[PDB]
Amino acid sequence: SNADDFETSLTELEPLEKDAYIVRLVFAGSTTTEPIVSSLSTAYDIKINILEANIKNTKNGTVGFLVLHIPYISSVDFGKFEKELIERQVKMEVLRHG
Structure with missing residues (x-):
């Protein structure tokens, strides 16, 4: 499926470094x-x-x-980043991290 292919493409970018993220x-x-x-x-x-x-x-x-x-x-900045998105009513999902 398209969702399977999408996930395969994220997994291809792994391993992520510490303090690197993939977010939606x-x-x-x-x-x-x-x-x-x-x-x-x-x-x-x-x-x-x-x-x-x-x-x-x-x-x-x-x-x-x-x-x-x-x-x-x-x-610390990632916490602030998410909070700013919350204030704009944008939800943030963490898909991958290091």
């Missing part, structure tokens, strides 16, 4: 993803690699998800 960001009626990804990168001085985007920009805002590879972020 879940959007359910938010403003656009771009100002959010560049904003997050600026705020934490981090590289963000977009692995996958499956997004619709609708009348009622942005719906869908981004899968992001973050090659390094400190444990």
